[PDB]
């Protein structure tokens, strides 16, 4: 989910209008620059279907949905990303001991505090009190 | 003893846990099996 | 584009092949995509180098294809200057009409 | 190098300063190479003493 | 750490430009990595040689 952050430059380059959405003038300009001249009604229906609002303004989620649909990520990557989303209640991409206790209590698989701390240490590699992406995936690989 | 080390909790952490519980996984079968395997290995 | 390099011993030792993407300015071809415009956006998103300062004036103008290819090839054509050492221990030769103080 | 011995300057300082100096001198390889991005402080220092 | 044996160099390596190298001996690296098993379990997987 964090890989889509690089699309910001592409959106800015495509949206030369500078009004926060793709304008008809910008579409015509880029179309003429590229050289191809398809049907105008084709572009109208394409932008209407792409844009969620459908009022001629293209927003970020309109392109984000298409990018996500066309991504077709790997099953293991999707599983690990979903697991990280569900463990991190705050959604900041960080896992703490208290979050581990909260998810353990919610799931019902409660463990003793010593056991939770030992699991944290087993996942911990730099020994400062953090659990990271590569740490968890390396623990899962074994 | 430098080799031996103590385990503990923090006041702010337990306070925020109490606050969170006041404002209170069922389909998490694979990670549940993961936790079971980790507990069995630790046993 | 390919450009082999010679050697100080009068031989060819190394090749040099350069690369560029023109996906956004060519005929659109797709194999398996969710939508046509989605595939178009995916293809155009990989043209950052061409869409940069190399051809930044393209959106402001029209029918710029007559100069975009020349602009792209101009940078590649300079590789002959980098081929002057010819993979050899090139000494720092003194410029003309300047004499060493020793 | 002039009339300065790097080894002697290192041995003049105590162990903690020596380790910190070694980390600073070799910091390029740790911070750029991805293989060292999972390094704890102890292992990082034990390696830096040797490079 | 994997071969656990010494081998003959099969090719020469030569300098081109003024370069700086950061060299580590085999014995000290092996001792450190066997000391830090948790670090080695990721160091072996992440470190890939160029040649």
In the structure encoding, which two tokens stand for residue A109, read together? 């698989």
Chains B and D make contact, 3+ CB pairs within 8 Å: no
Burial of residue B34, with CB atoms counted within 10 A of its CB: 0-12 exposed, 13-18 middle, 19 or more buried: middle
DSSP state of A2: G
For residue A28, give the nearest of C28, C48, C61 by alpha carbon.
C61
**A51 annotated as a binding-site residue:** yes
Burial of residue A58, with CB atoms counted within 10 A of its CB: 0-12 exposed, 13-18 middle, 19 or more buried: buried
- 3-class DSSP assignment, residue A134: helix
**A135 annotated as a binding-site residue:** yes
* Cβ pair C34:A66 closer than 8 A: yes
Burial of residue D38, with CB atoms counted within 10 A of its CB: 0-12 exposed, 13-18 middle, 19 or more buried: buried
DSSP state of C54: I
State the smallest CA–CA distance between residue A30 and chain C in angstroms: 5
For residue A33, give the nearest of C24, C70, C21 by alpha carbon.
C24
* Cβ pair E39:A134 closer than 8 A: no
For this PDB entry, the determination method is cryo-EM
Are A21 and A57 a contacting pair, CB within 8 Å? Answer: yes
| CA C71, C72, C73, C77 torsion-angle sign | positive
Q: Considering only CB atoms, which residues of chain C are within 8 Å of chain A? A: 24-25, 33-39, 41-42, 44-45, 48, 51, 58-65
| CA A116, A117, A119, A124 torsion-angle sign | positive
Query: Which residue out of E38, E39, E47 would a mutagenesis test of the A interface target, given it has the greatest number of A Cβ atoms within 10 Å?
Result: E38
* Assigned CATH topology for domain A6-71: Recoverin; domain 1 (1.10.238)
DSSP state of C51: I
- Cα Rg of chain B (Å, integer): 16
State the smallest CA–CA distance between residue B41 and chain A in angstroms: 11
What are the C-alpha distances in Å from D42 to residues A117, D18, D35? Answer: 20, 14, 16
State the smallest CA–CA distance between residue D34 and chain E in angstroms: 8
Residues of E in contact with A125 (CB under 8 A): 38-39, 42
* Cβ pair E45:A134 closer than 8 A: no
In the structure encoding, which two tokens stand for residue A87, read together? 């463990």
Integer Cα distance of A11 and A13 in angstroms: 5
CB atoms within 10 A of CB C40: 17
**A59 annotated as a binding-site residue:** no
């Amino acid at each position: 989910e964090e890989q889509i952050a690089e699309f910001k430059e592409a959106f800015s380059l495509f949206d030369k209008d500078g009004d926060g959405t793709i304008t008809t003038k910008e579409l015509g300009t880029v179309m003429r620059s590229l050289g191809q001249n398809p049907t105008e009604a084709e572009l109208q229906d394409m932008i209407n279907e792409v844009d969620a609002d459908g009022n001629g303004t293209i927003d970020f989620p309109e392109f984000l949905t298409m990018m996500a649909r066309k991504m077709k990520d790997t099953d293991s990557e999707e599983e690990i990303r979903e697991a990280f989303r569900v463990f991190d209640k705050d959604g900041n991409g960080y896992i703490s001991a208290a979050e581990l206790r909260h998810v353990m209590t919610n799931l019902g698989e409660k463990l003793t505090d010593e056991e939770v701390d030992e699991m944290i240490r087993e996942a911990d590699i730099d020994g400062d009190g953090q659990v990271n992406y590569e740490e968890f995936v390396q623990m899962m690989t074994a | 003893n430098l080799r031996k080390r103590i385990v503990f909790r923090k006041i702010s952490d337990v306070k925020r846990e109490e606050e969170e519980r006041m404002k209170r996984l069922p389909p998490d079968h694979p990670v549940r099996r993961l936790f079971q395997r980790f507990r069995q290995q630790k046993e | 584009k390919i450009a082999p390099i010679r050697n100080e011993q009068d031989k060819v030792v190394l090749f040099l092949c350069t690369f560029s993407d023109i996906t956004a300015f060519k005929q659109p071809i797709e194999d398996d995509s969710c939508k046509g415009w989605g595939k178009f956006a995916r293809l155009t998103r990989a043209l950052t180098s061409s869409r940069g300062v190399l051809q930044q004036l393209a959106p402001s103008v029209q029918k710029g294809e007559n100069v975009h290819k020349h602009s792209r090839l101009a940078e590649v054509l300079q590789l002959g200057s980098d081929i002057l050492p010819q993979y050899k221990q090139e000494a720092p030769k003194t410029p003309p009409h300047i004499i060493l103080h020793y | 190098s002039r009339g300065i011995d790097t080894e002697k300057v290192l041995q003049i300082c105590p162990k903690d300063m020596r380790a910190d100096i070694c980390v600073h001198l070799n910091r390029k390889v740790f911070k750029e190479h991805p293989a060292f991005r999972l390094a704890s402080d102890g292992c990082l220092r034990a390696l830096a003493m040797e490079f | 750490w994997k071969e656990a044996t010494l081998a003959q160099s099969c090719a020469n390596v030569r300098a081109l430009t003024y370069c700086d190298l950061h060299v580590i001996k085999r014995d000290a690296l092996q001792k450190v990595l066997e000391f830090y098993t948790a670090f080695s379990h990721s160091f072996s997987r992440n470190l890939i040689l160029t040649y």
